From a paper:
Strikingly, MakMvan displays a novel N-terminal domain, unique to maltokinases and conserved in the bifunctional TreS-Mak proteins, and without sequence similarity to other known proteins. MakMvan used ATP as the favourite phosphate donor, being strictly dependent on divalent cations, with a clear preference for Mg2+.
The protein displays an elongated concave-shaped structure that can be divided into two half-lobes with a central narrow acidic channel (~9 Å-wide and 30 Å-long), delineated by a positively charged surface patch on the N-terminal lobe and a negatively charged region on the C-terminal lobe, and displaying basic character at its exit site. The N-terminal lobe can be divided into two subdomains: a cap N-terminal subdomain comprising the first 88 amino acid residues (blue) and an intermediate subdomain composed of an anti-parallel β-sheet flanked by two helices (green). Analysis of the B-factor distribution reveals that the cap subdomain has the highest values for the atomic temperature factors and the C-terminal domain the lowest, suggesting that the N-terminal lobe, in particular the cap region, is more dynamic. As observed in related ELKs, His303 (HGD motif) stacks with Phe323 of the magnesium-coordinating DFE motif in the structure of free MakMvan. In the structure of free MakMvan the largest pocket identified (pocket 1) is located to the left of the exposed catalytic cleft and delineated by strictly conserved residues within the C-terminal lobe (dark blue spheres). Pocket 1 is close to the active site HGD motif and includes Asp305, topologically equivalent to the catalytic base in analogous enzymes (e.g. MTR32), and globally coincident with the substrate-binding region in structurally related ELKs.
Author numbering: 2 to 452
Write the structure that this text describes.
C-alpha cells in the first residue's frame, strides 16, 4: 500500500498524457532483498486500457538524505514500523545489486537475468544516474557500462536487446556492446516474455554524430567544403553498411513490393497537418505510384537512423538505440525493411545538420543566399562520402537503386513537413525545399538518369 498513482503522474518517463487514471496497483511484487522490491505496476485508464511500468523500491526505516523529491515514492507501515519507499535506481547499492544479478545470470522468482557469454561487468564502478535518459532510467557505472532499466514495459521481443545481441555475438564492432539483459513474463510463468532492461559497454570520450556534423556545418567562411568531415561521413557509411551486413546474414533477407499504399497513406495524413503539402501531393503520389510492383530487398534494420543515433569513439562509429520506428507497435518495429530506408534517414539528418543554421538566421544575414549555397554543397559532399563508404563495404552503392532510395527520402521529408508545420513552423522550409529537390532526384532515377 503505497500511493503509486500520486507519485507516478509527476515523472518525466510517465506517459499518461492528459488521461484520468482509474488505478495504479502492483501486479507483481518480487523481493530482491529484505529492503528492496521489484514491482510491476499496472496503471488502468478509464477506457479500460492498462499500461505497465517497472519500479524498483528501496525501503528505509528513516529518511535517507541522498534521495530527492522525484525519488521519494511514499510511505507505508511494515513489520518493523514505518518505512519510506524510494526509487531504488537512485540508490548506488541497489543499482549495483541489479548489476550483480545480471552478472550471475540469476533467476529470482519470474525474473530472469542473463549475462552475455564472456562479458565482464563493472561491479566495482561508481553508479550514477544519467539525467539525459528521458524515457527509461539509465545508470552509468564508472566509465565502463550503462544499465538501462525500462520504465514502460510491453510484451514481446525487445528489438534493441535483440539486434544488439545479434550484432555483439557476431563480433560486429559498431555497437555499444550488449553485456547483459533481464526480462520477466507478461502474465506469470509460461506467458509472453517482457523485457525489463539491458547493460551495454559505455564509451567514454565519445562524440554524437549530430554534434560533429553541426559543428562542421557551422564553421565560418567554409565555402570550400572540407575533407575532414567527409572522411568521417565515409567511415560512418562503412559502419552502417557493416551493421546491415551482419543483420542480413543473421536474420535473413526477403523480397516485398515497394509499399506504395503505406507511403500514400502517410502523405494523405501529412497533407492534413501541412497545407503547403497539398501543392506537392500530386507530384509525390505520381513518383510513389511509379514504384508500384517494384520488388525491394528487405532485412532487419535500425529503423530510426539519424545522426543522433551514432557515436564516434576514439576508434569507431557505433550505432545505438535499435528500438525501431518511433510510435509503432513492437510487431511493426520488428518487420524487415529496406536498408535504403536507413540510408535515407542519415541523408535527411545531414540536411537538417546543415540547414538548421539557415532557419535560425534573420533573412538579412543571408540576403544573397551564399550561406544556403554552402549548406547545399556541404550536404552534397557528405552525402556522397557516406554513400561511398556504404558502397565500399556493401559492394553495392545505395545510389544504384536511386529511385527506391529517393522515394524513402521523400517519404521522410513529407513526414518531417507535417511535424515542422505542427511543432516548429520556422523549420518547415527545410523539408519543403527537400521535397522539391528530391522530386527531381527521384524523377531522374525513375528514368535511370542517375549516375
Ligand atoms: Mg537515441
Amino acid at each position: 500500500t503505497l500511493a503509486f498513482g500520486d507519485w507516478i503522474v509527476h515523472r518525466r518517463w510517465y506517459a499518461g498524457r492528459s488521461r484520468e487514471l482509474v488505478s495504479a496497483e502492483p501486479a507483481v511484487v518480487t523481493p530482491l532483498r529484505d529492503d528492496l522490491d521489484h514491482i510491476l505496476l499496472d496503471v488502468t485508464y478509464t477506457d479500460g486500457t492498462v499500461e505497465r511500468y517497472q519500479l524498483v523500491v528501496r525501503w528505509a526505516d528513516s529518511p535517507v538524505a541522498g534521495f530527492g523529491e522525484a525519488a521519494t515514492i511514499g510511505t507505508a507501515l511494515g513489520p518493523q514500523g514505518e518505512r519510506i519507499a524510494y526509487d531504488a535506481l537512485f540508490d548506488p547499492d541497489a543499482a549495483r545489486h541489479l548489476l550483480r544479478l545480471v552478472d550471475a545470470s540469476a533467476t529470482v522468482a519470474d525474473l530472469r537475468f542473463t549475462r552475455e557469454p564472456g562479458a565482464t561487468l563493472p561491479l566495482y564502478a561508481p553508479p550514477k544516474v544519467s539525467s539525459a535518459e528521458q524515457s527509461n532510467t539509465s545508470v552509468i557505472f564508472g566509465k565502463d557500462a550503462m544499465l538501462k532499466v525500462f520504465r514502460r514495459v510491453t510484451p514481446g521481443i525487445n528489438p534493441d536487446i535483440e539486434l544488439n545481441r545479434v550484432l555483439a555475438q557476431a563480433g560486429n564492432r559498431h555497437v555499444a556492446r550488449l553485456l547483459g539483459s533481464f526480462e520477466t513474463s507478461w502474465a506469470g510463468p509460461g506467458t509472453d516474455r517482457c523485457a525489463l532492461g539491458m547493460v551495454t559497454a559505455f564509451a567514454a570520450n565519445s562524440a554524437e554524430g549530430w554534434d560533429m556534423a553541426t559543428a562542421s556545418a557551422r564553421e565560418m567562411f567554409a565555402d570550400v567544403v572540407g575533407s575532414d568531415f567527409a572522411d568521417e561521413s565515409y567511415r560512418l557509411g562503412n559502419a552502417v553498411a557493416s551493421v546491415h551486413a551482419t543483420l542480413a546474414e543473421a536474420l535473413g533477407t526477403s523480397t516485398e513490393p515497394f509499399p506504395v499504399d503505406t507511403v500514400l497513406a502517410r502523405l494523405q495524413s501529412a497533407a492534413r497537418s501541412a497545407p503547403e503539402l497539398a501543392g506537392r501531393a500530386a507530384a509525390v503520389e505520381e513518383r510513389y505510384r511509379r514504384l508500384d510492383g517494384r520488388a525491394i530487398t528487405v532485412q532487419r534494420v535500425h529503423g530510426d537512423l539519424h545522426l543522433g543515433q551514432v557515436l564516434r569513439t576514439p576508434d569507431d562509429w557505433l550505432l545505438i538505440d535499435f528500438e525501431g520506428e518511433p510510435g509503432q507497435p513492437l510487431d511493426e518495429r520488428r518487420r524487415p525493411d529496406s536498408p535504403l530506408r536507413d540510408v535515407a534517414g542519415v541523408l535527411r539528418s545531414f540536411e537538417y545538420a546543415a540547414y538548421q543554421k539557415l532557419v535560425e538566421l534573420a533573412p538579412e544575414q543571408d540576403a544573397d543566399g551564399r550561406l544556403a549555397d554552402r549548406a547545399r554543397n556541404w550536404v552534397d559532399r557528405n552525402s556522397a562520402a557516406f554513400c561511398a563508404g556504404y558502397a565500399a563495404v556493401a559492394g553495392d552503392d545505395p545510389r544504384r537503386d536511386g529511385d527506391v532510395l529517393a522515394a524513402y527520402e521523400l517519404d521522410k521529408a513529407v513526414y518531417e513537413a507535417a511535424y515542422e508545420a505542427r511543432f516548429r513552423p520556422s523549420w518547415l522550409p527545410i523539408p519543403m525545399r527537400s521535397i522539391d529537390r528530391i522530386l527531381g532526384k527521384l524523377a531522374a532515377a525513375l528514368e535511370h538518369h542517375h549516375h
